Design a protein around this ligand. Sequence first.
Ligand code: HEM
Length: 153
Amino acid sequence: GLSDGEWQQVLNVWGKVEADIAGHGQEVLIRLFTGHPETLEKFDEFKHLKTEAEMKASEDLKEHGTVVLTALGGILKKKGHHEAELKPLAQSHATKHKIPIKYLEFISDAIIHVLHSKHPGDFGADAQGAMTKALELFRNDIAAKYKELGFQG
Ligand code: HEM
């Protein structure tokens, strides 16, 4: 867990994202897909967008980025009391999309990268500490449900 002070740093940084969720969303997906090409293959509707420039030219990709960060923001705002929002996501990523936990690790690092990239010098050490914790929490709770389901990957 996170202290209230850590949660207040998480939500304060999330406010920066909300200034433009789609722009942040697109950056996260691109970092993921260029950094770990294997992840693109799980998306049937984007697997043909193998380079950064192709990825940038798709509003469909950008609306998916929007969906991803609006879901995440909604989870962060629960401050760890997220059992109800997390179970459906774990189940669908495990059973429908077949997303190994490693990919969640990847997107987690991608978010940190993007925050530093879009707000250089504005994402403090303290802020980073708290955001990291928050994503680890998220990952760890998804991990528990994967285990329940035996999604070996
Ligand atoms: C911050 C972590 C993530 C969040 C919040 C998230 C959220 C979502 C949401 C809300 C949906 C739509 C509803 C559903 O199908 O459950 C979805 C679908 C999907 N997710 Fe994720 N996701 C995350 C990570 C990932 C990663 C790392 C991958 C793959 C490398 C992935 C692959 C997919 C795919 C393939 C679908 C179906 C897509 C489509 O129909 O275009 N997700 N995700």
